[PDB]
Every structure is written in C-alpha cells, then in structure tokens.
Design a protein around this ligand. Structure first.
Ligand SMILES: COc1ccc(/C=C2/C(=O)Nc3ccccc3C(=O)N2C)cc1
Ligand SMILES: COc1ccc(/C=C2/C(=O)Nc3ccccc3C(=O)N2C)cc1
Ligand SMILES: [Br-]
Ligand SMILES: [Br-]
Ligand SMILES: [Br-]
Ligand SMILES: [Br-]
Ligand SMILES: [Cl-]
Ligand SMILES: [Cl-]
Ligand SMILES: [K+]
Ligand SMILES: [K+]
Ligand code: NI
Ligand code: NI
Lengths: 288, 288
C-alpha cells in the first residue's frame, strides 16, 4: 500500500496543500528547525510536568477522551516565545492555510497544544478530529472544502515501536466507513520538526507505545476558518504579551477582527464597523 | 396565502420553536415589554444619531450591503442596561434558543444590533442572512438543523406602508430558488416589542418605506451555536460592565467558555481544561 507523501518545507511549498487535498495526509520534512523544536520543548517542559490528568476533578472542562496518562498543554502563546514568534509566523504554515481556506476567508488557531504520550500509551481508536467540540462539522456536505486541518509536529522521534501516528490515505473522501480498520493504515515515521498534515476528515489515530520506556511528544496545531470557534481561549493572555506579537499572530489568537471570503464581506468580531485592533488601539511587535 | 403565525410570549412558549421549524417564521407578540422597548430606545438613541454611514471611509470593516441611509449600532452591552440585563436574560429567548440549538450545544449572540431605516429606504433584495459573514453555512447539508436564528424585534411600529419585513413561509426548506419573488411574501405587521423570529434559511427582506416621513427602528438579535464566530466582538467591553452581568449573559457575549452537545464534549474557548470564568476569576452580578 502507498506510503504518506513526503514534501520539502523549503522547495515543494505550492505542492503541500494539493498533496493533502488528494491523499488526506502529507509529511512536511523539517516543518520546524531543530533550534525551534529545542526552544519550544524547553519552554513547555515544566507546564507538561505540572499538568494534571486530562479528566482531573479540579477541571470544569475535563477531557474524558484522552488516556489518563496523556498530558495536553494548550494556550501556548504566554508559555513559549518560540511558539508565539516562530510558529505563529511560519511562512510554510501560512502558505498552506491560505491555499486550504481561500474559499472561506481568514483562518486562525483552533488549538495549539503540546501533547506528551506516556510509555505504554495505547493506540487511539481510529477517528476524525473535531467530533468532541464541533458537531456542526458532521452536518457539512460531503464535498465541502475542509474547514480545519491539523499539523501534527514531532517534538521527539515518531517510530512504529513508540506509537507514530496511523492514517488511512484517501479516507478524507470516505462517506461509507465499513472499510475502517487498522489494516488500512500507514505510519507517519518522523524526526523532530517533521509535521504530519491531515484534514478534519482524514481517518487517523495515535499509535500504541510498545517499548514501555519511550515518551513521545508532539505539537498539534489545528488551523481552522475564522468562522469556527477555537477549542482554546487567549482572552486571559496579558496585553503586553499580545502587543509583542505580529498583527498576523494577534489575528491567529483571536486578538483581531476577521474577514470572510464573501465578495461584500461584513466581517467577524467587529465593533460598529471597526476592527478590535483599531478600536482597542492594539500595538504590535512591542518587545517585552 | 397563509399569514405569519402569531404566538404569545406568555402562554405559547413551547409552541414557538416548533412553529418556526415548520413555517420558517413566527411573530412573538410582546416579546419585549413596552417599558424595556422605551429604555432600550432611550439608551441607544444618541449612538444611532452619531453612527456614520454603513460604508464610511473611516471604517476598516465597512458594510457595503446596507442602504447608505441605514444606521446599524452593535456591541449594545456597554450602551444599554436594558439590553445587557433584560434582553440577554430573556426567559422567552433562552427557551426558544435551547429548543432550537440542543442538537449542537451552547448558543451565544452572533450579533445584537439596533437598525434605524430612514424615510424612503428601499426594500432589501430577498435574501438569507449570514451570506456576507459565514460562507460555511452555504456548505451545510440541506436538512442540517438551523445553526442561527434572528429575532427581528420592532422598536417602532412595522406597517405595510413604512417597510414591515417580508418573509416567504416555508422558504427555509427551499433548495430550488426559482420561485423567489415578492409575489410569494407575507408581511410582519408588528407593534413595538413584537418580534419576527426567522432562521438563517428563511427567505426575507426589509420592506420599502413608502411614506417618505416614517423612521422604522428594530433590534435584530442573531442567536447562533457557540461553534460559529460572532459578527461582533465584546473584547473591548470594560470588565466592570461584564462583571455586572449574569453568568448566562457573560456566556452570550463570549466572556465564558462554551460547550458542544457531543457526549464527551471537550469544550470551546477553554484554557488547559478550565473555563475562561474560572481562570480569570470573573465575578458576576456585581452592580456598577
Ligand atoms: C484516546 O482516543 C482519542 C483521543 C482524542 C481524539 C480526538 C480529539 C479531538 O477531536 N481533537 C483534539 C485535537 C487536538 C488534540 C487533542 C484533541 C482531543 O483531545 N480529542 C479528544 C480521538 C480519540
Ligand atoms: C440592502 O439589502 C440587504 C441588506 C442586508 C442583508 C443581510 C445582512 C446579513 O446577512 N446579516 C445581517 C444581520 C443583521 C443585521 C444586518 C445584517 C447585514 O448587515 N447584512 C448585510 C441583505 C440584503
Ligand atoms: Br491519548
Ligand atoms: Br499522534
Ligand atoms: Br438596509
Ligand atoms: Br426588516
Ligand atoms: Cl483527579
Ligand atoms: Cl464616508
Ligand atoms: K473516537
Ligand atoms: K443580498
Ligand atoms: Ni486525532
Ligand atoms: Ni435579513
């Protein structure tokens, strides 16, 4: 069976979205440099260690789906200079997103999360993303352009033995799911900084950790049209942090108004015909 | 031809959403009391008078669709005690919205706007709402439950002569629009405080103002699932104003996390498994 197409971040940029449109998945080699991976890992390290179980009794939005041994840290902008500067301004991410979402209009981060999978973490059931947050997506026409995509960035090696992601190629176009089986999957074997790009219709799962020794870490960036509500809020991020960002990064975090692709678009998150950023006199690129 | 069904806010509450599901429109008699209408009118009056043309050159999100003589004022919470207290906590509005949106989950305000139509304002072309802001809605399956509804509340008399709304009954179920004609419409004749309730698929239009003397005013409340991005932002509303509101009103303005109807919902606008309101220690019902 066909392996996941592998593309250059550097050379093949125009080919990435077309590849995912056709196959439902592509591996972007060196999506992030090892330097950015090192910085992001160092910055999020302590937040992963203090993070309670996904369904902790102290949480008012517990995640009952993730393995109890899994750790998920989102709202990364206040945690990680590497995330809010390098990742939110990624030339490769923005080319792919504008290619993917041009029919709809502006896009933003639905969730940027570091996930750490514990040794012996079981395989996730085969699934499509967004079904625990956005019931609306199941009501879209079968041939509706993808309204979200997910960059699964390796922050540690992804191997067959340590639970590298499974995908079913072509499954983003499936209506009948009677053929859904682990028999139909191929693996995203990845070095740190490689990214597996899938759509919200690609059938996939986290793999089984079978070594009982290896901790696997990823940065999952769900990018979606600005018409869909993010899984995460940046409302509590300090204004000085927001004002250190590029206007583009501010938009991705919901600290800007948003535009649809409608010819006479009237906009999203506006204030009497003016933008958030104009109304609030929101500064940009002010160092901390 | 059949007239728009008229229902009691007081007695018929369980019948309102079923009526709109069947017919695409219903008139809710005395949706708002005359006292609430009087207060809301007095509170928004000066903001309507200072409001520039919809496509003013000073605006970075101009509205090129509305008549140049029309005035639209949104983000009403900071302007209007009557809006943020009485209207956002309306028992009738919340029963209808929970009836309409239960398949999807939480709902919030996509836009609360006062519109003032000038004497001699022309009829709007027959349309469905949301097509200048949410291209996604056109990609929903034909039988997808409505993801937004619009309360068109009369703040002045709606008469045939002064441009009372037109609706095509049953048009929320239309796929083929070859029968779209003003010949197919009936009128929402309404007293101040009556509301015309339509869905995002009901074909309708503002009527022609033919007297050349009458100014018509309405409060349009587009309620939508929390999975869809509002047309307007409350991000610049002062925290003391937000903290004066009920927890429900805070949720409607996007100053709370949101839940989907998914059995193991993981939520919207959360912060590492906790709500906005828990994270920010957001107080409620603190008088100004
Ligand atoms: C154990 O099996 C699983 C675990 C997760 C999912 C899927 C999701 C989801 O749809 N969205 C995201 C997106 C990014 C990161 C996490 C999640 C997440 O938390 N869940 C629940 C399915 C199956
Ligand atoms: C002159 O003809 C028109 C004028 C308006 C619309 C429709 C919209 C719309 O879809 N959404 C809303 C919702 C509430 C209030 C205003 C609007 C609005 O601004 N427009 C543009 C159509 C036709
Ligand atoms: Br997991
Ligand atoms: Br994974
Ligand atoms: Br108009
Ligand atoms: Br109207
Ligand atoms: Cl616990
Ligand atoms: Cl002007
Ligand atoms: K699942
Ligand atoms: K129109
Ligand atoms: Ni997944
Ligand atoms: Ni309309």
């Amino acid at each position: 069976k066909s392996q996941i197409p592998r593309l250059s971040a550097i050379n093949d940029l125009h080919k990435i979205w077309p590849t995912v449109e056709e196959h439902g998945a592509a591996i972007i080699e060196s999506f992030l440099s090892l330097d950015i991976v090192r910085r992001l890992n160092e910055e999020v390290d302590p937040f992963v260690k203090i993070e309670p179980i996904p369904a902790a009794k102290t949480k008012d939005h517990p995640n009952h789906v993730l393995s109890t041994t899994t750790r998920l840290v989102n709202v990364l902008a206040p945690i990680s200079k590497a995330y809010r500067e390098d990742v939110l301004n990624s030339k490769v991410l923005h080319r792919i997103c504008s290619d993917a979402f041009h029919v709809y209009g502006d896009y933003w981060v639905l969730m940027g999360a570091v996930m750490e999978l514990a040794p012996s973490n079981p395989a996730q059931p085969l699934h499509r993303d967004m079904r625990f947050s956005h019931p609306i997506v199941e009501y879209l026409k079968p041939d509706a352009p993808a309204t979200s995509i997910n960059f699964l960035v390796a922050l540690s090696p992804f191997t067959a033995e340590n639970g590298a992601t499974h995908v079913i190629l072509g499954s983003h176009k499936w209506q009948n799911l009677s053929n859904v089986s682990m028999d139909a999957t191929v693996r995203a074997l990845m070095n740190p900084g490689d990214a597996l790009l899938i759509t919200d219709s690609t059938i996939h799962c986290g793999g089984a950790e079978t070594t009982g020794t290896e901790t696997r870490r990823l940065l999952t960036i769900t990018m979606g049209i600005s018409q869909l509500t993010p899984l995460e809020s940046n409302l509590a991020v300090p204004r000085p942090v927001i004002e250190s960002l590029t206007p583009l990064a501010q938009r991705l975090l919901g600290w800007a108004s948003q535009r649809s692709a409608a010819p006479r678009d009237i906009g999203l998150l506006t204030i009497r015909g003016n933008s958030i950023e104009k109304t609030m006199n929101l500064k940009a690129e002010q160092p901390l």
